[PDB]
């Protein structure tokens, strides 16, 4: 269908997400240098997203356009994970899980830095695409784990908090299986489809966890209540695409449908995050 165009939409939504998350950090800690750095890095990521989108529009349907957009997506997710771990550290400064989130986000950024290095040395290679996609998947797994920790911190007595933790662990297992498949044959579409499937499953967990957080932060907000059904519909859409991707892992149609589900889930996440950003003000 429209692989390259859908990646441009994914990159744009992630840039908006990074900016909103930096606004939340500044709302929680107005005088902190970390929230200042979060805003500066989110702006830098948005600039690289803009540059990649303009480059791809001029080189339609090319491996280079795909690689450059995936690199912007990976860098944007790296700063999201770092800023989110800082937020988790703000809620419970002396908690060991907060220190673990910061360490996990740092390691995800190093993996992202190494994948981009390889991709820049092999811009005409599918191995570069699969490597960058795996860095994206691992960073999303860190985000999902950190977000489930935040959810548990707001209401440790809640069954939904443990459901988010278990869901994040299952998405991590999907990333681990994708990394195994890609390592065995990184120049096949199988590696791309299975890694995209893990990404879609992880974003589905994130969207449902984020909708729970919005509702917990503002039980009387009608916008926050609506995020549950919206995240569930996006999660069902991802589940459909994942089933196609594991049925025909070398299908271009399966790859396209999975990218569409990723883009749609990110739109729900971005909307939900905006509701949270207003709640905290």
Author numbering: 0 to 280
The study reports:
Here we describe efficient routes starting from validated parallel and antiparallel peptide assemblies to design two families of α-helical barrel proteins with central channels that bind small molecules. Computational designs are seeded by the sequences and structures of defined de novo oligomeric barrel-forming peptides, and adjacent helices are connected by loop building. For targets with antiparallel helices, short loops are sufficient. However, targets with parallel helices require longer connectors; namely, an outer layer of helix–turn–helix–turn–helix motifs that are packed onto the barrels.
Encouraged by the successful design of sc-apCC-6 and sc-CC-7, we extended the seeded design approaches to target α-helical barrel proteins with five, six and eight central helices. By contrast, the six- and eight-helix-based targets bound dye, consistent with accessible cavities, which were confirmed by SEC-SAXS and X-ray crystal structures solved using molecular replacement. Together, these additional designs delivered the de novo proteins sc-CC-5, sc-CC-6 and sc-CC-8. The five-helix-based proteins showed no dye binding, although an X-ray crystal structure revealed an open barrel. Thus, the cavities of five-helix-based barrels appear to be too narrow to accommodate dye. For the parallel targets, the experimental structures show minor fraying at the C termini of the inner helices compared with the seeds and models, which appears to improve the packing of the external three-helix bundles. However, the symmetry of the central parallel helices is maintained. The backbone RMSD values for the repeating helix–turn–helix–turn–helix motifs are ≤0.5 Å, which is expected given the low sequence variation in the loops and the hydrophobic cores of these buttressing helices.
